[PDB]
Amino acid sequence: QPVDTIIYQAKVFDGLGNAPVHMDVAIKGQQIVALGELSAYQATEEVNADGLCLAPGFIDVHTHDDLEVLRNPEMAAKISQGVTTVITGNCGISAAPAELANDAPDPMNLLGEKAEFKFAQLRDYIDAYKVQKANVNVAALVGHTTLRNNVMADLLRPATAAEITLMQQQLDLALSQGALGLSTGLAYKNANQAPSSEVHAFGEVLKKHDALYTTHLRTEFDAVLDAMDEAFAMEQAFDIKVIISHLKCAGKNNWGRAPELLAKFSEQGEHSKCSCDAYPYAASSSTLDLNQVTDDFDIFITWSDSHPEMAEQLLADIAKQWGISLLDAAKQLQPAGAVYHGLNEDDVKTILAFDKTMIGSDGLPCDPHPHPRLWGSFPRVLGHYSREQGIFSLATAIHKMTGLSAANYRLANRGVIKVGHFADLVLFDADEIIDNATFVESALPASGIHQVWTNGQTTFKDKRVLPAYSGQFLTS
Ligand SMILES: [Zn+2]
Numbered sequence: 001q002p003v004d005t006i007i008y009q010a011k012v013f014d015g016l017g018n019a020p021v022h023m024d025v026a027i028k029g030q031q032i033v034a035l036g037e038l039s040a041y042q043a044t045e046e047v048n049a050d051g052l053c054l055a056p057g058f059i060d061v062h063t064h065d066d067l068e069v070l071r072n073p074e075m076a077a078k079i080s081q082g083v084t085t086v087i088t089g090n091c092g093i094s095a096a097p098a099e100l101a102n103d104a105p106d107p108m109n110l111l112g113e114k115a116e117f118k119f120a121q122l123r124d125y126i127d128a129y130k131v132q133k134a135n136v137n138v139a140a141l142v143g144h145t146t147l148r149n150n151v152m153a154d155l156l157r158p159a160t161a162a163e164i165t166l167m168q169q170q171l172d173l174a175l176s177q178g179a180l181g182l183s184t185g186l187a188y189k190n191a192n193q194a195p196s197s198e199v200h201a202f203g204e205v206l207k208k209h210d211a212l213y214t215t216h217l218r219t220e221f222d223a224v225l226d227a228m229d230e231a232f233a234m235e236q237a238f239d240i241k242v243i244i245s246h247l248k249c250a251g252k253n254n255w256g257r258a259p260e261l262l263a264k265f266s267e268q269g270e271h272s273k274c275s276c277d278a279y280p281y282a283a284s285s286s287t288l289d290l291n292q293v294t295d296d297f298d299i300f301i302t303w304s305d306s307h308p309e310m311a312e313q314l315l316a317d318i319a320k321q322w323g324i325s326l327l328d329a330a331k332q333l334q335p336a337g338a339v340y341h342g343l344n345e346d347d348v349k350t351i352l353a354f355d356k357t358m359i360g361s362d363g364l365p366c367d368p369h370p371h372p373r374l375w376g377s378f379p380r381v382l383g384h385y386s387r388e389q390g391i392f393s394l395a396t397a398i399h400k401m402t403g404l405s406a407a408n409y410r411l412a413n414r415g416v417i418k419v420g421h422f423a424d425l426v427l428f429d430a431d432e433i434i435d436n437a438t439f440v441e442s443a444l445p446a447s448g449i450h451q452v453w454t455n456g457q458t459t460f461k462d463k464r465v466l467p468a469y470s471g472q473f474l475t476s
Pocket of ligand 1: 091185245
């Protein structure tokens with residue numbers, strides 16, 4: 001009857017949005033084994049959490065960490081924020097099941113270089129993960145654009161009916177091997193010509209596996225509401241769980257339209273289970289897209305293969321030095337990465353406050369000067385938006401990165417501090433927790449996190465990332 005660890009006298013948040021409770025938490029093996037008051041229990045290790053808070057480990061529902069978790073199993077960018085589980089395979093791109101011919105078509109470079117895609121089937125990817133495991137648990141979506149690339153040489157078109165049949169069987173096999181569902185990125189060049197009927201062709205497979213559908217909307221600018229109708233039609237037709245990724249209304253035309261996005265959820269019809277996620281910043285980030293170049297707001301170049309000397313500079317400054325328009329400068333900078341300061345802060349606050357919204361970092365792990373969301377998202381929610389701005393309580397903030405997310409993705413026995421659940425846990429100081437990553441110094445680690453456990457083993461303690469490698473692959 002001894003346990004490995006008891007955490008004494010933390011302010012414990014259960015992850016369900018309830019008021020915190022002062023009590024002790026016992027860990028043995030991978031599991032939370034006792035809650036309440038455990039001075040009469042025998043523990044090898046005793047942690048004094050007086051004055052601190054304990055919460056379930058944070059679940060990053062929107063990552064591009066597919067290959068990063070193999071390259072970098074310590075996962076400092078996420079672990080130092082309190083993240084214990086990552087959801088991979090978003091916006092239509094995944095590491096598996098993928099077989100590459102010529103190149104990795106865009107946006108697969110967000111994941112890694114062509115040579116890294118060594119996983120013809122999902123089980124190859126799970127095998128690779130299990131060589132070292134990682135400091136985070138992994139749950140994987142299958143990317144629709146990745147599936148298209150397996151069967152299409154020319155991506156600038158709808159898939160044929162026969163190519164769709166192949167993709168249906170590839171998704172079915174991947175789901176049987178453990179994938180959670182399918183993601184799309186319908187705004188990207190290499191998926192934009194997929195009609196809604198092509199996406200609908202996956203619905204029966206998803207429904208048969210009780211699997212998920214996540215989507216980067218076909219547009220997030222003027223016609224964003226039309227794009228949301230597309231996502232709801234998947235829920236209407238198949239009664240499956242749908243999640244809209246990084247909800248936003250982008251572009252100067254659309255600042256102030258966040259209430260329209262919220263109200264659009266009233267058009268779901270029969271089922272009302274569509275969810276969404278967001279990152280806590282008023283700026284987006286992706287490979288430089290000529291269609292988004294504007295003088296309406298700041299655009300910052302993060303990398304450029306053509307002109308690396310212009311990295312970490314404002315597009316308007318680059319254009320002035322070069323003596324040409326912003327659009328012509330962008331043409332010469334490609335291929336390049338950018339941070340677009342194209343969102344409105346009041347819109348962001350409304351979308352974060354929305355009770356359907358989970359927290360997702362959308363961190364880009366191959367970016368050499370990344371958007372700071374890669375390193376600051378979850379402490380920014382707890383410290384900036386909860387404590388400082390007062391948009392919501394700490395209990396609400398925690399719920400939106402733990403229990404809400406485990407429920408929506410059906411992650412068994414995670415996201416909640418309850419006896420019998422896994423001991424993914426974060427110990428932190430509520431008054432000091434804060435993001436330090438800025439747009440200029442975008443990899444500064446957060447403050448206020450004292451200790452992190454993944455499946456009962458310490459992966460972070462007193463500013464040290466620790467290679468416990470106790471994460472697991474979470475199969476459906
Ligand atoms: Zn996206």
